[PDB]
Amino acid sequence: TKKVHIISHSHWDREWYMAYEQHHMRLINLIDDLLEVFQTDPDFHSFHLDGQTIILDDYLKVRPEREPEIRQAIASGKLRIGPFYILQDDFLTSSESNVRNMLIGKEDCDRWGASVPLGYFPDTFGNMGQTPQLMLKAGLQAAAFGRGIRPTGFNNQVDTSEKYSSQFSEISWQGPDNSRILGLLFANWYSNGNEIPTTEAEARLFWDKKLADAERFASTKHLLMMNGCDHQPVQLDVTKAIALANQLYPDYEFVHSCFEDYLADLADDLPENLSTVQGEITSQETDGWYTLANTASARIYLKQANTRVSRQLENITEPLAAMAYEVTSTYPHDQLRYAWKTLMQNHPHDSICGCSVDSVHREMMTRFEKAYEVGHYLAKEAAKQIADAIDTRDFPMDSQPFVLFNTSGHSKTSVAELSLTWKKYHFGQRFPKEVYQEAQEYLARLSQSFQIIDTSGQVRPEAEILGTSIAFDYDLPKRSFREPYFAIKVRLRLPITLPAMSWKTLALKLGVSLYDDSNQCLENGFLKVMIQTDGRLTITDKQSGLIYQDLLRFEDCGDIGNEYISRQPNHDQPFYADQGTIKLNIISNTAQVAELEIQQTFAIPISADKLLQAEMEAVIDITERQARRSQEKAELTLTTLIRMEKNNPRLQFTTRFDNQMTNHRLRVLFPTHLKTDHHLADSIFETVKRPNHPDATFWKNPSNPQHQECFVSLFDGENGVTIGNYGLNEYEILPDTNTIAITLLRSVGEMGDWGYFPTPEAQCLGKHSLSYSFESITKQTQFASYWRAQEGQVPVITTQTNQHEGTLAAEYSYLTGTNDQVALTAFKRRLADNALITRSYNLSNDKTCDFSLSLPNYNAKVTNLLEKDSKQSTPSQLGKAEILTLAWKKQ
Amino acid sequence: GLEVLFQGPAMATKKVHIISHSHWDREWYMAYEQHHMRLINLIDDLLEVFQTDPDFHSFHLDGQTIILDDYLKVRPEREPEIRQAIASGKLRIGPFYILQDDFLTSSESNVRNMLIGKEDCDRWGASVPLGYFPDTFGNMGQTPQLMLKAGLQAAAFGRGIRPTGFNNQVDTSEKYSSQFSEISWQGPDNSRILGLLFANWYSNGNEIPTTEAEARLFWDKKLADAERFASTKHLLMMNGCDHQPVQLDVTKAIALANQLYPDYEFVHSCFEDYLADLADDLPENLSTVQGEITSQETDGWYTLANTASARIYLKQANTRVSRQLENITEPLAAMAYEVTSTYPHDQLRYAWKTLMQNHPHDSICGCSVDSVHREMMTRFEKAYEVGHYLAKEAAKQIADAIDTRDFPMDSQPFVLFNTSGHSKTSVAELSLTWKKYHFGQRFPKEVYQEAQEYLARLSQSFQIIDTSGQVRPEAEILGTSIAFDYDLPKRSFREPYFAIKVRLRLPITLPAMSWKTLALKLGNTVSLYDDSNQCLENGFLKVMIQTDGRLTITDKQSGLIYQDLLRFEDCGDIGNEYISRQPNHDQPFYADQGTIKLNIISNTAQVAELEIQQTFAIPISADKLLQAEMEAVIDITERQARRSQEKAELTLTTLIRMEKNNPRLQFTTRFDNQMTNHRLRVLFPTHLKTDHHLADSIFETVKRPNHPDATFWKNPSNPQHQECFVSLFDGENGVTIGNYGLNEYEILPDTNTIAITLLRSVGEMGDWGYFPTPEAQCLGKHSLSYSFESITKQTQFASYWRAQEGQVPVITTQTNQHEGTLAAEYSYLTGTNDQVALTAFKRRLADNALITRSYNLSNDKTCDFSLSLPNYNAKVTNLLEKDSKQSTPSQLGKAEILTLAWKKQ
Ligand SMILES: [Zn+2]
Ligand SMILES: [Zn+2]
């Protein structure tokens, strides 16, 4: 005797094959229909709103007058909401974003008065390894998902060579930290109970199939029927359907249910023989063609923009505002929430994955700009608040003080690129022309040289003055009208080391190079970098002695696929930039920094052939496509700026070009020839270990694209390579040579999936600039290479202030006790009480480590990810893959 | 004390009304969010001062209710506090939603601003009885009528009137001079309102000192400045400025002022109180200003009229969304209500609020930074999508209720709608779905093959029939194809299919606000263009394409001949987003002097499409000096920059479309702009003998001189604003040029040439600093649409509504064979008049009455008003849709705007 739980739902992709507003208007219809059916049908139990609270906001933005009816429907349990804000892509949103989704989701649920105790990942294109820890520490003990695993027959014997097979639709999901949750697999998809018939003959055919399908995998008598699908209207006659089903099947108890009741029933009946699945679930034991992993390189410009806003909020704005609270006794919670919600409107999977129509991705760019602007405003305000409260009296009156901040979790060594204001010539009531000329005359008369001093008056000899100029600028005072002026600007380079979460005040006053042109060699204490005749690099590690030849190869291939899936044409042969025309240009060359440009011009097919258009129009599966690249070629010019800094082991690259070719992919390759069968990728709160070969038992796709956050690394036990990136979230390991391949551009012409949706802007025509890095590592520098790749995305922050008394010291470290193996991801304050919150995680899944983090004259208390206090004592060590959130209060 | 037993004369006092405010441009020299965060600071400071200073009376929130929404979007928890501040009168709000540019927003948009503003004010429970135009770059001539019929009797404005003292003889030739800062503003319909001029700007009372020495200097100047122009003892001191923070110590400043000046009563005041005091003390008669205020009597350099051609792509987008909402979505939904008993009020409000977020003057004027205008494009898309969804739904609701049983089962019915206020004759360009091959559980490829085989085996021809089964022989089948498509049912899952699509043109005439049902089925002479002659000819016009690509057009009715029409002129522009400046000694480049080629696109008896293509070399940019002049904030009039020596080829392609029974010749000019700091115009030399011209303006065809005022004007150019058209008419014959979002024109008076601006490319914002705006160069592809019609006395007014309604295509939708309550052919209104424009056809929120709005296309003559909706009775309402007690007129007064509510009989 089975219990058949019918859960009515709609999987509501916020924006996808139509612009947001087209989906939005149909969402109004859905909720209108729900509110009406709650009135006309007393037996309609509930409706699951797809796990995302944003739906409620979207509805009320159009029908604000319906707020009381919405609140009532939630209060009665007829609308089952959240527990998330949006339904993300796990891998393409930042580690912090994965938590903020839950923080905002919970805030919304608390406001409405109800939640659903189920992490909801119905459609997610691969599931992060840390889902179990992320759920447990967000007050959730279960997650439901539809992708990444294929249920083996609940029928078959043990064997168990298949790591990602499951007997049942219920699993014990274990993460790298040993956290365990219930994994509820939609084994028959989230549409298995869609459109239940209300007439006998049709109902019989439907239920005989559906019951058998669910029983094939159920570990209990509780069968889950998901009554909904993508943008599915509510089934208005579902009560009639359920009543019929009960009449037709005396041995089955059909009930209109909800996820909370379903989990309750499961809890009572779950057996002890659930399959365990360990870590990330990314379709490892499939044919590899439909992982949709190539969303990582769809519209890379979106991922770059996301990275910029994420770093702004997490690593600049929040840390500065957290510290500024000392001065102001306030922290901008409302403005930050507004910025975070704006950013996360770009985090629904179809949005960030770049797998929607053109209109959707144009709208996303605007959202990125808005969230950035808010974060940028708040960061500048916080930095000023601190600087204006620093005791800057040690600097002479004929100097211009400025404060430099490292807002990251470890020591930051860099050559900071600065533009400081030396003098302001205000417009007043004069003609701007007169004021401009006065500034010109000051510079014409200037005979002294600009210098950088510390509080002791000591000159920093390593600073390099690059030039002076006049530039219009303005100030916006808090208590008076705008103030326009011409500024005398001083452009300079400043080598500096700043400890974690620290500031240093300096001031501007009046008072053998790295590159060898005869050798075409960039050299510092760490690396010797030989630019080859073909533009590729030979890099020698000066500590280990290891030599890497033919690094930095640019590779252009055909792509006849879509926004989800890359497909190289049959017989595709790459075009290599190094086989074209090579030119070298020195941009700068001092003892502190060298910048070299390597330029290649090579001919590539301008497009795909005409067959592609026919194959897309006919909705031909990507694996069957016969289209090739065009015969006609055009010259593509790549320019890569290589930046070496004196005391920096990390070599920085920026590759720029104007893309005027369609249906192709550009990658940069780093062949390592390292002896190892695995690699390490920056994933959501974990450095996840992955095989270099996909599983040859199941895998058919000639490629194995994988997701990364800030870096990917190969390491043989003593030596290795770490490649960092900025918003370049797709990599591949080429196992024959252990080459790291980073995707810089992927251009396609259609969305893909269920139909033909032309997306010409997915071709990514126009200018691009991609940044990435190389570091050669040893056992001793491995973990530092990982936080450098993460924290290297965040520049030294500067702000100017005058000479004044102050309550703050001119240099200060807000925290101490850094560990190479311990990443810092959050430094913020708590909404409830303004307590300082930190979040750290173990960069290893294999080893515990010391946890030394300390904020001077604060005590730490352990919280969960939602920043609610736990009973756990503060550890002195981190477990494998542990994510530790701490609230800090004055001693 | 001693004055009581030895009394002297009772002395008069002045009353100094200090109104604290902030003029809050929503977005401008920074992105919206940068201004938005500072707005949070302003309101935060305000709420704090209300709690700490009992003497702080009120703050004027810049006449725009959007500010409240913007604040609460960030601090939704402050709603109770905001409500209490409004209820107590400490925050003075609206009466508008936003502060628009008048001329660059649609006629209806100018009303919707007031409708939404009033709605917001009603929700909050307070308003301010003052139309608010503090900074508007030109004030529309209908402001007095628009205010009165939205229940407002006063408007405040800052630009375009020169107040003279009470010490000098008024000069009667100065139409835009005033004696005082208070005027009677009289509109073309004879409506009068109180005009409140910011004679000393809206910043005259900014940052009032709180220390005696400085306060003396301040007030000695400010009092004299205000008294100079005040008609009463009541002096207006505006305590604020652009993005000005609240003056937290204004109470102290007012207290000090009261101590220092015994003869002056300083009070922390508000506009409502100021207007009440004026009602008591205003003289019975004030200087009259008649009509539009556009800075006619100035040097013409700082009118900011060239905002009309800044980022023309914005104006085109705005026109598209405005037509979508006003003339497609609203009319369809209004009619669909008869079938469904529901109308999408909430969704329409959302669409309108979204669109009007692009209507603040700095937004729509194109005079902000690059980030702002990128954000605006997203808002236009959003508003359009909402309107487009609702129109499609409404058309389907109507079609599904039509009795389509007269059509045979082997045919595909479709309904054609004219959603405009007059008869619509056009050649509809259609793509109909003949058959659908659903995916089901098959591989799409197999379904695709089945559709292909169907088309391959097709032996019959497609035809269009009516309800009597009669074939329409004028219809032209252009082709058939297979296209992926999908349906989104109300009650089930998406339905993908391959559709057999039939592409065709259908000449059709549809009465005003009407539909007609036809069907597609299968069944069994002299072209308009003569290539030997290079001549397009119908019954109205003979159009000879000259060897140089300009046109010679002969009006076949009147015999008049116009040579050398359609000249494309490229000039330099070394100005900014506000002001166009041609360099010293600039010589135009003409496309007709380049390489000319001609291409026949289509040519039948019903339609001919010709492309004239010119390639001509123009300077790629301004010279190197312009950058230095921008960087040093050199005034545009003093700039010495010229165009670059280096040139590149610019290719223009203009598609000319002539239709058989259409007097209006349609033009679409396209090109890829890759040159900076230039202006492209199209010229129509008329040589018509007339000293005035007529432009489509806000609910009026405004009359303007062809020469600017030489007593004052120094600018060599005289750019003017237009909505849908501009016209020259000599009393018997004329020319009407229509446009689609090309809102800047100029009349060149020596030849009476109508010049339409197609592109203006500049590299900085302008105004108070150097704000580089590379995207204001408008690089990339452009497509501009406009029209020519030759008119007589008998066709003048029809040429005007054709230019307006010709922006709106015939609407179509398909439906199957079914019973229905609606007739297959129906006219929803009758009693059209060439002289009466229809601008609104919508429903009212309160009771779903059908609202119509019409206006008189003449400022000079009355006309009959015949509008009738069968099955309905009308009563007169104001612009805000509030019933009046006025009887329905049978005539329209000069420039009258008439709003009616219709209810079933
Ligand atoms: Zn989805
Ligand atoms: Zn303004």
CATH code, A36: 1.10.1240.90
**Is there a domain that residue B314 lies in?**
yes
Tell me which residue of B628, B633, B770 sits closest to A432, measured CA to CA. Answer: B633
Report which bound ligand comes closest to the CA of A564. 1
Q: Which residues surround ligand 1, an ion (CB under 5 A)?
A: A 13, 123
Q: Is B395 in contact with B332 (CB distance < 8 Å)?
A: yes
Nearest beta carbon to residue B385 from set A21, A236, A476: A21
Number of independent structural domains in chain B: 7
User: Residue positions of B in the annotated binding site?
Assistant: 23, 25, 135, 361-362
User: Residue positions of B in the annotated binding site for Zn(2+)?
Assistant: 23, 25, 135, 361-362
The reply to whether B241 touches chain A by the CB within 8 Å rule is yes
Report which bound ligand comes closest to the CA of A295. 1
Cα(B236)–Cα(B19) distance, integer angstroms: 8
Respond yes or no: is residue A123 known to be catalytic: yes
Tell me: do A602 and A694 sit in the same domain.
Answer: yes
Tell me: do A129 and A107 sit in the same domain.
Answer: no
Tell me: do B136 and B240 sit in the same domain.
Answer: no
CB contact under 8 A, A233 and B491: yes
Mark which of B246, B271, B294 sits at the end of a domain.
Answer: B294
Cα(A703)–Cα(B884) distance, integer angstroms: 74
**Quick one: three-class SS letters along B272-283?**
HHHHHHHHHHCC
> Which stretches within B88-159 are classed as H helix?
107-124, 143-148
Question: Which two three-digit tokens encode residue B656?
Answer: 């000319």
Residues of chain A by 3-state class (helix, strand, coil), percent to 5? 25, 35, 40
Question: Which two three-digit tokens encode residue A406?
Answer: 């490292």
CATH code, B394: 1.20.1270.50
Residue B195, beta-bridge partner list: B155, B183
Please report the sign of the dihedral spanned by the C-alpha atoms of residue A727, residue A728, residue A730, residue A732. negative
Question: Which two three-digit tokens encode residue A454?
Answer: 């510390």
Q: Which residue in the block uniquely carries the two structure tokens 């590729």? A: A536
**Quick one: three-class SS letters along B601-620?**
EEECCCEEEEEEEEEEEEEC
Q: Is A2 in contact with A221 (CB distance < 8 Å)?
A: yes
Tell me: do A734 and A780 sit in the same domain.
Answer: yes
Give the DSSP H or E segment for B256. Answer: helix B250-260
Contacts of B769 in chain A (CB under 8 A): 472, 474, 484
Tell me: do B661 and B539 sit in the same domain.
Answer: yes
Question: Which two three-digit tokens encode residue A872?
Answer: 């756990």
What backbone phi and psi angles, to 5 degrees, belong to B139? Answer: -110, 125
Question: Which two three-digit tokens encode residue B646?
Answer: 């280096």
Quote the minimal CA–CA distance from B203 to chain A in Å. Answer: 11
Cα end-to-end distance, chain A, whole Å: 61
User: Ligand 2 centroid vs B357 CA: distance in angstroms?
Assistant: 14
Ramachandran area for residue A222 (φ above 0: left; ψ -120 to 50: alpha; else beta): beta
Nearest beta carbon to residue A369 from set B31, B74, B385: B31
Tell me: do B787 and B650 sit in the same domain.
Answer: yes
Question: Which two three-digit tokens encode residue A230?
Answer: 């993508």
> Rg of chain B over CA atoms, in angstroms?
30
Please report the sign of the dihedral spanned by the C-alpha atoms of residue A23, residue A26, residue A28, residue A33. negative
Cα(A165)–Cα(A148) distance, integer angstroms: 10
User: Ligand 1 centroid vs B593 CA: distance in angstroms?
Assistant: 57
Contacts of residue B598, defined as CB under 8 A and 6 or more positions apart, other chains included, come to B534, B545, B549, B610, B611, B612, B613
Tell me: do A604 and A526 sit in the same domain.
Answer: yes
Q: Which residue in the block uniquely carries the two structure tokens 């913020």? A: A828
Q: Which residue in the block uniquely carries the two structure tokens 């580089």? A: B772
Amino acid, single-letter form, for residue B673: N
**Is there a domain that residue B299 lies in?**
no
CB contact under 8 A, A334 and B75: yes
Cα(B70)–Cα(A844) distance, integer angstroms: 45
Question: Which two three-digit tokens encode residue A235?
Answer: 């089934």
Contacts of A433 in chain B (CB under 8 A): 632-634
Method: X-ray
CATH code, A871: 2.60.40.2220
Nearest beta carbon to residue B37 from set A63, A335, A477: A335
CATH code, B537: 2.70.98.30
**How many CB atoms within 10 Å of residue A5?**
24
Cα(A555)–Cα(A741) distance, integer angstroms: 9
* Residue in B24, B32, B37, B119 to test binding to A, most A beta-carbons within 10 Å: B37
**Is there a domain that residue B791 lies in?**
yes
Burial of A831 (0-12, 13-18, 19+ CB in 10 A): middle
- The one-character DSSP state at A316 is I
Report which bound ligand comes closest to the CA of B201. 2
Mark which of A56, A89, A117 sits at the end of a domain.
Answer: A117
**Is there a domain that residue B2 lies in?**
no
What backbone phi and psi angles, to 5 degrees, belong to B831? Answer: 75, 45
Q: Is A381 in contact with A463 (CB distance < 8 Å)?
A: no
Amino acid, single-letter form, for residue A99: V
Tell me: do A521 and A641 sit in the same domain.
Answer: yes
User: Ligand 1 centroid vs B493 CA: distance in angstroms?
Assistant: 14
**Is there a domain that residue B779 lies in?**
yes
Residue A885 to residues A359, A865, B541: CA-CA distances in angstroms? 39, 6, 79
Nearest beta carbon to residue A19 from set B41, B375, B381: B381
Cα(A360)–Cα(B668) distance, integer angstroms: 28
Tell me: do B94 and B40 sit in the same domain.
Answer: yes
The reply to whether B83 touches chain A by the CB within 8 Å rule is no
Long-range contacts of B341-348 (CB under 8 A, 24+ apart): B343/B843, B343/B848, B344/B390, B344/B393, B345/B843, B345/B845, B346/A28, B346/A62, B346/A63, B346/A65, B347/A25, B347/A28, B347/A62, B347/B386, B347/B389, B347/B390, B348/B390
Tell me: do A252 and A359 sit in the same domain.
Answer: no
CB contact under 8 A, B31 and A232: no
User: What's the farthest any 2 CA atoms get from each other in chain B?
Assistant: 117
DSSP A543-602: TT--EEEEESEEEEEE--S-SS---PPTT---EEGGGSEEEEEEEEE-SSEEEEEEEEEE
Nearest beta carbon to residue B445 from set A229, A233, A620: A620
Tell me which residue of B595, B580, B432, B435 sits closest to B503, measured CA to CA. Answer: B432
Contacts of residue B139, defined as CB under 8 A and 6 or more positions apart, other chains included, come to B102, B133, B157, B159, B160, B292, B293, B294
Q: Is A735 in contact with A674 (CB distance < 8 Å)?
A: no
Q: Which of A123, A541, A682, A753 is catalytic?
A: A123
3 state DSSP class of A126: coil
Q: Which of B62, B135, B189, B555 is catalytic?
A: B135
Residues of chain B by 3-state class (helix, strand, coil), percent to 5? 25, 35, 40
**Degrees, nearest 5: CA angle A706-A708-A710:** 160
Q: Is B652 in contact with B784 (CB distance < 8 Å)?
A: no
The reply to whether B382 touches chain A by the CB within 8 Å rule is yes
Mark which of A74, A102, A117 sits at the end of a domain.
Answer: A117
Please report the sign of the dihedral spanned by the C-alpha atoms of residue A419, residue A424, residue A429, residue A434. negative
Tell me: do A360 and A476 sit in the same domain.
Answer: no
User: Ligand 2 centroid vs B428 CA: distance in angstroms?
Assistant: 43
CB contact under 8 A, B488 and A231: yes
Q: Is A822 in contact with A444 (CB distance < 8 Å)?
A: no
Q: Is B753 in contact with B739 (CB distance < 8 Å)?
A: no
3 state DSSP class of B665: strand
Q: Is A210 in contact with A225 (CB distance < 8 Å)?
A: yes
Q: How many residues does chain B have?
A: 905
Tell me: do A731 and A616 sit in the same domain.
Answer: yes
Q: Is B189 in contact with B167 (CB distance < 8 Å)?
A: no
CB contact under 8 A, B484 and A28: no
CB contact under 8 A, B242 and A21: no
CB contact under 8 A, B378 and A366: yes
Segments forming the whole domain that contains residue B902: 829-905
Closest-CA residue of B relative to A336 is: B74
Contacts of B768 in chain A (CB under 8 A): 482, 484
Q: Is A728 in contact with A772 (CB distance < 8 Å)?
A: yes
Cα(B500)–Cα(B485) distance, integer angstroms: 10
CB contact under 8 A, A436 and B633: yes
The reply to whether A767 touches chain B by the CB within 8 Å rule is no
User: What's the farthest any 2 CA atoms get from each other in chain A?
Assistant: 100
Question: Which two three-digit tokens encode residue B721?
Answer: 């604003």
